[PDB]
Ligand SMILES: *[B-](O)(O)CNC(=O)c1ccccc1[N+](=O)[O-]
Ligand SMILES: *[B-](O)(O)CNC(=O)c1ccccc1[N+](=O)[O-]
Ligand SMILES: [Cl-]
Ligand SMILES: [Cl-]
Ligand SMILES: [Cl-]
Ligand SMILES: [Cl-]
Ligand SMILES: [Cl-]
Ligand SMILES: [Cl-]
Ligand SMILES: [Cl-]
Ligand SMILES: [Cl-]
Ligand SMILES: [Cl-]
Ligand SMILES: [Cl-]
Ligand SMILES: [Cl-]
Ligand SMILES: [Cl-]
Ligand SMILES: [Cl-]
Ligand SMILES: [Cl-]
Ligand SMILES: [Cl-]
Ligand SMILES: [Cl-]
């Protein structure tokens with residue numbers, strides 16, 4: 001008889017979400033093993049009838065064989081996550097109908113998936129929202145595709161200034177954020193805390209202009225994005241991801257820039273000990289350690305500021321000692337409020353969370369800010385109660401390679417003379433330390449100091465800076 | 468033997484905070500009774516030696532007599548409040564040393580005090596911070612002394628506009644709020660949610676200019692304020708109150724405008740049944756029902772907006788069914804962050820809370836916003852767990868007498884022609900319903916539409932309104 005086991009070898013089942021998810025993945029690994037065993041070439045494998053035969057064969061091989069499939073699942077943790085969604089999932093319901101949910105808890109150092117939530121209740125809806133369903137990651141794209149890459153390329157530092165002035169998509173329509181057409185210049189911190197859209201748009205346009213291999217970064221984390229030539233890319237337009245895959249991007253940032261491929265199956269053995277399949281770690285330095293650790297600091301204040309999520313308040317009340325762990329994270333919201341995300345990490349773990357409706361109709365305006373935050377606070381509490389040391393008490397910290405520059409708070413660049421139609425002008429004023437991931441740190445203030453901005457924009461900004 | 472009892476007649480003690488507080492008040496009532504019994508005149512009562520004699524006599528009378536002193540205290544509730552501060556008071560400590568605390572829970576319909584917190588731990592510090600210590604109520608003054616009176620006098624409605632532009636105290640110093648010297652025009656809702664200072668300053672100046680009997684309102688609620696001629700009065704300057712007294716002001720607003728005097732002793736009887744003392748209700752309509760119910764709606768969004776307090780997030784996580792009760796409230800913060808307040812009500816109850824240091828040194832910047840909010844969320848949860856129906860599920864609602872006007876969102880006044888140096892101008896634009904407590908509702912827009920503002924201010928505002 002074949003068995004699926006938890007990571008400690010305790011049997012899950014002989015051959016709900018846990019069962020079908022782990023069995024499905026194991027059948028895929030058995031497929032690969034059986035095709036290679038029978039000497040089926042890649043070309044023969046392209047044949048649809050051969051594929052169907054080998055997929056059925058892999059299913060039956062497990063049913064009838066005596067294979068031992070070792071999963072990465074932690075029994076206590078995954079059980080506590082099921083209880084949490086059963087008891088607390090109703091907190092998601094926001095008057096837009098029954099709200100669905102997916103979560104994945106991942107070991108930052110290995111990519112192992114310790115536990116997950118596939119949905120509100122398998123018996124009523126079997127769609128697996130942790131592993132199968134793909135939805136836009138919305139503004140949780142921004143740290144990975146826009147800001148993180150710009151920092152890694154030395155095009156941006158932690159206190160760099162960006163334009164949030166009103167600007168239009170190429171087609172003439174305003175770039176919106178809730179009901180605002182934008183404001184003025186702002187720091188990266190403020191752009192991220194609030195999740196403004198315009199600054200991310202200009203950052204991705206700056207990457208394009210510098211011919212940065214953005215696809216290179218993303219594919220190193222296993223993202224598949226069919227088209228990079230999309231204005232709204234850094235806000236999640238043109239991207240659709242599973243919670244498991246997206247959790248892996250945030251694993252990369254939390255793990256000081258080093259990607260480990262997500263997995264739920266670690267090994268499959270025949271009864272006699274032959275290894276059919278074994279996971280093989282292939283670590284990749286996707287962002288420099290400087291860049292990742294700079295981003296950690298920014299995503300810490302995303303949660304602390306409480307601007308787009310109540311999570312820290314919710315978790316402080318439920319478990320104040322766990323709230324004092326070093327949480328960092330980012331929210332995501334789609335344009336019609338169709339998908340909400342909250343991605344959380346401590347140095348040890350990352351927990352991804354999505355909520356939404358299976359038919360894509362809109363959630364309430366505050367579903368991500370309050371409901372999903374409160375739910376994920378209960379879920380994080382449940383995980384900790386079931387495994388008290390799992391989140392860990394380590395702090396994220398700036399890598400020694402980070403370059404620290406003194407820059408004007410107004411310009412996010414080093415003080416000095418600047419040309420402002422006429423008066424070549426001594427740029428003075430209060431300063432701040434800005435973190436960079438290049439060799440030389442911040443440049444001298446230049447007239448076009450911000451990421452993005454129109455001529456009129458700069459005239460207004462500099463006007464303001466003068467007095 | 469004399470006994471002090473809970474409201475249901477269960478004995479507290481024969482003759483911690485509960486004991487000393489109730490005994491002290493009972494000794495004061497016995498003093499009054501014994502002086503009147505012995506036919507001591509008011510003039511003889513002014514004699515310091517006679518007073519000392521009669522206070523000692525009242526103490527001994529209780530010690531030796533067989534009096535039954537009935538308190539308003541609810542045993543389960545008050546016990547749960549003690550357990551809460553014992554278990555959760557450490558959540559107040561914010562790195563400025565040991566933080567003290569006072570709370571009073573009051574029945575809105577009667578003024579009865581059902582329970583209270585006198586401090587972190589009687590055995591270590593006996594100061595009674597619920598009944599005895601007096602501190603500035605800071606910005607929790609604003610609803611009572613400024614906005615509530617202005618509304619009640621028909622000088623303001625729920626969507627009235629106020630100046631938050633920079634302005635100075637008479638002595639030249641800027642009126643500050645945290646580190647801001649002010650912004651621009653704003654609605655009453657936004658002034659209250661954020662607790663801006665300048666708008667409250669101008670509202671109290673407008674009351675002065677209209678010769679409003681502000682002292683009349685305040686003394687009807689039992690406040691003693693020695694000097695009304697203070698610019699910072701509506702921000703709590705020149706006022707010092709006990710938590711018990713201040714809870715009574717918020718009781719008045721919650722009780723649709725009707726004050727009931729706070730009390731902890733309801734009756735004292737000799738052993739043979741003679742009534743030495745009995746509380747006598749003397750209800751007073753301090754604000755019209757219109758005004759109070761308009762204020763309830765505004766203080767509901769103070770908590771909902773979560774701008775100056777995380778309370779709603781904290782309580783949603785601890786007890787989401789109780790968080791769905793109809794909470795309204797207001798925070799207070801002193802200038803050096805010396806005192807933080809959070810006043811909470813449902814239609815049934817009000818709970819006052821102060822925290823601070825006995826020597827008045829500063830708390831952390833977020834002590835009121837986060838620490839005291841989280842603590843009071845646990846305290847409200849503890850009260851409900853001990854008496855499940857005590858907070859009640861009733862909603863606050865606008866009294867039928869409220870006048871509803873359609874007013875410009877920009878002016879907070881009715882649309883129409885206005886004089887703006889030159890072009891007599893048709894004032895158009897998006898509108899909103901504003902609530903008033905007078906007969907005629909909102910006036911027609913006039914040039915000086917806002918509460919307060921300088922000439923330059925209005926030129927800027929109208930400039931902006933034009934385009
Ligand atoms: B974020 O706070 O969720 C903001 N993101 C968006 O507005 C977004 C979401 C998904 C696709 C596109 C898009 N756009 O800025 O256009
Ligand atoms: B409120 O949000 O606490 C603002 N209040 C104050 O600034 C205040 C507190 C106490 C006394 C005076 C004062 N002033 O505005 O000057
Ligand atoms: Cl499951
Ligand atoms: Cl568009
Ligand atoms: Cl690319
Ligand atoms: Cl993908
Ligand atoms: Cl491209
Ligand atoms: Cl896998
Ligand atoms: Cl075998
Ligand atoms: Cl925090
Ligand atoms: Cl919050
Ligand atoms: Cl420098
Ligand atoms: Cl460099
Ligand atoms: Cl006590
Ligand atoms: Cl002053
Ligand atoms: Cl007066
Ligand atoms: Cl007083
Ligand atoms: Cl006066």
Ligand SMILES: [Cl-]
Nearest residue numbers: 492730731732
């Ligand atoms: Cl009393």
Ligand SMILES: [Cl-]
Nearest residue numbers: 737738739740
């Ligand atoms: Cl008697």
Ligand SMILES: [Cl-]
Nearest residue numbers: 770771772779
């Ligand atoms: Cl709320």
Ligand SMILES: [Cl-]
Nearest residue numbers: 871872873874
């Ligand atoms: Cl009207």
Ligand SMILES: [Cl-]
Nearest residue numbers: 905906907908
């Ligand atoms: Cl009138």
Ligand code: NA
Nearest residue numbers: 195331332333
């Ligand atoms: Na967001």
Ligand code: NA
Nearest residue numbers: 662798799800
């Ligand atoms: Na305040």
